[PDB]
Amino acid sequence: KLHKEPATLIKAIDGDTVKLMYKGQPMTFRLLLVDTPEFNEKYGPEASAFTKKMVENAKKIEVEFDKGQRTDKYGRGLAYIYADGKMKNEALVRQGLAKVAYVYKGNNTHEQLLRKAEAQAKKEKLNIWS
Ligand SMILES: Cc1cn([C@H]2C[C@H](OP(=O)(O)O)[C@@H](COP(=O)(O)O)O2)c(=O)[nH]c1=O
Numbered sequence: 001k002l003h004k005e006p007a008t009l010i011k012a013i014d015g016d017t018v019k020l021m022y023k024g025q026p027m028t029f030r031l032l033l034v035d036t037p038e039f040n041e042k043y044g045p046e047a048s049a050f051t052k053k054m055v056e057n058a059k060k061i062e063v064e065f066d067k068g069q070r071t072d073k074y075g076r077g078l079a080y081i082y083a084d085g086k087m088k089n090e091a092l093v094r095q096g097l098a099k100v101a102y103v104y105k106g107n108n109t110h111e112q113l114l115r116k117a118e119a120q121a122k123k124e125k126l127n128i129w130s
């Protein structure tokens with residue numbers, strides 16, 4: 001079992017990174033288990049727009065760390081991020097705006113949930129799968 005913790009928005013960055021205040025400190029978070037296109041790539045802008053809209057409209061942002069590493073080699077927090085109870089990581093995949101990616105042993109709790117969303121986005125031919 002994982003736990004949701006509070007955080008507040010500082011600023012949207014791109015499809016799979018965001019700046020949040022967590023335990024009172026500014027931190028850039030990278031979303032576990034996904035990969036969005038870079039802003040400069042196809043669907044990059046749409047991914048960035050999606051994440052921005054989702055976080056900027058939320059009344060309540062939460063951070064959920066997995067079992068394993070909580071920061072990556074660049075000092076980014078590694079988390080599942082929720083906006084008003086909806087997971088951003090899963091939402092991007094379900095929409096065909098991210099691929100399931102970077103699945104490392106022991107930070108992979110929600111792997112099967114996200115693959116199931118990817119299968120459905122691919123069936124629908126959405127965005128990246130179009
Ligand atoms: C998502 C994730 C990325 N990373 C590192 C792997 C990649 O190293 P490299 O920079 O050497 O390619 C990079 C991809 O992040 P980005 O897709 O944001 O560039 O971030 C992790 O270490 N753990 C993770 O859980």
Ligand SMILES: [Ca+2]
Pocket residue numbers: 016035036037038
């Ligand atoms: Ca990326």
